[PDB]
Amino acid sequence: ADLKSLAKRIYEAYLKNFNMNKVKARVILSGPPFVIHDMETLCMAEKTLVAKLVANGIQNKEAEVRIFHCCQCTSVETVTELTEFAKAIPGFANLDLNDQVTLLKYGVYEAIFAMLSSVMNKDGMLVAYGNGFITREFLKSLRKPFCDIMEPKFDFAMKFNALELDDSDISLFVAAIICCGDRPGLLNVGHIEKMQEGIVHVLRLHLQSNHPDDIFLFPKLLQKMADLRQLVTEHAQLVQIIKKTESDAALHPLLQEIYRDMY
Amino acid sequence: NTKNHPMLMNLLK
Ligand SMILES: CC(C)(Sc1ccc(CCN(CCCCC2CCCCC2)C(=O)NC2CCCCC2)cc1)C(=O)O
């Protein structure tokens, strides 16, 4: 097996299937995106970037619920990108379709929150296909429970970003997240465990090559995977509280399907 | 479980 080549295939699949990558995001976050830092600028951004949403219609819903709807749309788009990426992970398409569904169900949010780090800095996050920037303080200013969604993701991201990974690393980390043999309800556990071992070995060797300065980067990343599982379990609980208690926050059917019976 | 995830199944197909 050619492990440098497997790494390259996974990296190429990640550049092809995600609209946002870390170099792009840094090109933009340097310098311009429209800054959402208060309710006035939120409303302006809605009219320029999500015009249909407020061409009348939910325009009369609370700002928090409008933002939540836009976030659901973005997650729907990201699940599609992750599915295309997964299908290009060597070996994934040969798994039983039931196992492909299970791995996606449990992996997508861990991958989402890992990738979200690439568009975050300590002051905010790049959104809307690179055309907006929403401040961390604005999100904290929203009414409960909506102000409680993003702050743990910024906290994860600041420390994840301090590892100074690039897209060649992150692509493999996302593949390792997806190709996880301990998800509940897998059918061919042994096959998936061997696929996992293979991807994790590709990751280990790549980090040795690409980060010779950081001898602990591989175990640091294993710990980040465990941190992400916890972050998703907590996020799912918060989403359940929102869907149950906020009537204008009904879940899009694809997201309901992912969260249903997850944790 | 493909039966319980028709929308994910459609993305995979
Ligand atoms: C939707 C729930 C129910 S909660 C949840 C989950 C995720 C997020 C982050 C969504 N987002 C901000 C999207 C902000 C859009 C913006 C709003 C203001 C007006 C202009 C448009 C974003 O940029 N996500 C990136 C995408 C690139 C790859 C990584 C993820 C927020 C809430 C879910 O669990 O899915």
Numbering used by the authors:
A (entry chain A): 201 to 231, 237 to 468
B (entry chain B): 683 to 695
From the article:
Peroxisome proliferator-activated receptors (PPARs), composed of the α/δ/γ subtypes, are ligand-activated nuclear receptors/transcription factors that sense endogenous fatty acids or therapeutic drugs to regulate lipid/glucose metabolism and oxidative stress. PPAR forms a multiprotein complex with a retinoid X receptor and corepressor complex in an unliganded/inactive state, and ligand binding induces the replacement of the corepressor complex with the coactivator complex to initiate the transcription of various genes, including the metabolic and antioxidant ones. All four coactivator peptides contain the consensus LXXLL motifs that interact with the activation function-2 (AF-2) helix 12 upon ligand activation, whereas the two corepressor peptides contain the consensus LXXXIXXXL motifs; we investigated their positions in the cocrystals. The same applied to the interaction of PPARγ-LBD and the SRC1 coactivator or the NCoR2 corepressor.
We have succeeded in obtaining 14 PPARα/γ-LBDs–SRC1 coactivator peptide cocrystals and aimed to obtain more with the other coactivators: CBP, TRAP220, and PGC1α. Next, utilizing the same seeding procedures and the PPARα full agonist GW7647, we obtained the PPARα-LBD–GW7647–TRAP220 and PPARα-LBD–GW7647–PGC1α cocrystals and ascertained their structures (respectively). GW7647 bound to the same loci as was previously reported, PPARα-LBD–GW7647–SRC1 cocrystals. In PPARα-LBD, the α-helical LXXLL motifs in the four coactivators were located near the AF-2 helix 12 that was formed upon ligand binding, whereas the IXXXL portion of the consensus LXXXIXXXL motif in the NCoR2 coactivator was located in a position that interfered with helix 12 if present. In summary, the coactivator preference of PPARα-LBD was presumed to be CBP >> PGC1α = SRC1 > TRAP220. PPAR coactivators demonstrate varying intrinsic biological activities, including some enzymes, such as histone acetylases (e.g., CBP) and ATPases, responsible for chromatin remodeling, and proteins functioning in between the NRs and the transcription initiation machinery, such as TRAP220, PGC1α, and SRC1.
